Amino acid sequence: AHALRKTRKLRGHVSHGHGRIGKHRKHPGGRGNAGGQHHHRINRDKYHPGYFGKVGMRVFHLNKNQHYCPTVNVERLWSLVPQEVRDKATGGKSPVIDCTKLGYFKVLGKGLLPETPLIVKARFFSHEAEQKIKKAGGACVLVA
C-alpha cells in the first residue's frame, strides 16, 4: 500500500524525515552485526546476554530422530479418548490409549485425572504419571 507509507506525506520536505544534521548516510555504524564487541557492546550486552563465547559439548552430526520424544500430560489423556470408546467403556472397563499411535512417546504427570480409570500404553512414563494413573485406578503398559 504505497498510498499509506510515510513517503506519501514526506513529499515537499527536504530531508524526508531523516534530519538536516545527521542525514541519512549509507552505513554510519557498520554493516550487519558488526562491532558487537567494540562500539555496539552496550546494545549487545543489554539485549543479547550470552551471545559471545561457546559452552557445552559439541556433537558431530547430531541424530535428532534419536532424541525425538513427543510428550503428553496426564491431564490431557482423556481428551484423546474418542467419544465412541467412552460410550463403550462402561461397567468396570477402562478405555485403552495407544500414545505411540497417537504420536506421543512419553507421558508426564501434570494436572489431574478423570473419574474413569484408563489403561495407557506408552514407550515411557514419568514416575508422577505412573503414580497418578495407578492412584486413579488405571494401569500403565510399556510398549516397544
Partner: protein, 125 residues
C-alpha cells in the same frame, strides 16, 4: 474452565456471564455445569459442551434485551498479560534481576548462553 469456575461460586449459579472475549473449549475440564453466557464468539467445542450441559448461549443484543442495565451479570475476560509478546516485555534481558525473554533465532547451547549468562564466562546477571 474459567466460565465454569465463575458460575459454580455461591450465588452465581443463575447469573448470566458476559464476556467480549472468545469462549474456547478446555480439554482439561471434565465436568461442565449449566452456564448462561452472552458472548461475541463461542468456539464449536465450547458451544457444544455448554448446550449439552443444559446451558444457554446468547448474543450481545439478546443480552441487551434481557438485562438492559446489566442486572444479574458476571463480567469476565481472558488473561490479558498471557501472550508470548508480553513475555518479551519488561527490563532488558541483560540487566540484573531480569527474567525477560530474549529474541533468539533458535534454542540450544549455541544461542546466547555463554557470556553474561554464567559465571564461567566473564559474568552472570
Amino acid at each position: 474452565a474459567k466460565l465454569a469456575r465463575a458460575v459454580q461460586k455461591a450465588g452465581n449459579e443463575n447469573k448470566t456471564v458476559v464476556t467480549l472475549s472468545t469462549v474456547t473449549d478446555d480439554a482439561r475440564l471434565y465436568t461442565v455445569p449449566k452456564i448462561s453466557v452472552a458472548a461475541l464468539h463461542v468456539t464449536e467445542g465450547a458451544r457444544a459442551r455448554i448446550l449439552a450441559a443444559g446451558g444457554e448461549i446468547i448474543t450481545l443484543d439478546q443480552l441487551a434485551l434481557k438485562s438492559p442495565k446489566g442486572e444479574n451479570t458476571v463480567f469476565l475476560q481472558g488473561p490479558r498479560s498471557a501472550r508470548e509478546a508480553e513475555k518479551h516485555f519488561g527490563p532488558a534481558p541483560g540487566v540484573p534481576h531480569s527474567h525477560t525473554k530474549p529474541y533468539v533465532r533458535s534454542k540450544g547451547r549455541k544461542f546466547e548462553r555463554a557470556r553474561g549468562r554464567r559465571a564461567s564466562r566473564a559474568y552472570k546477571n
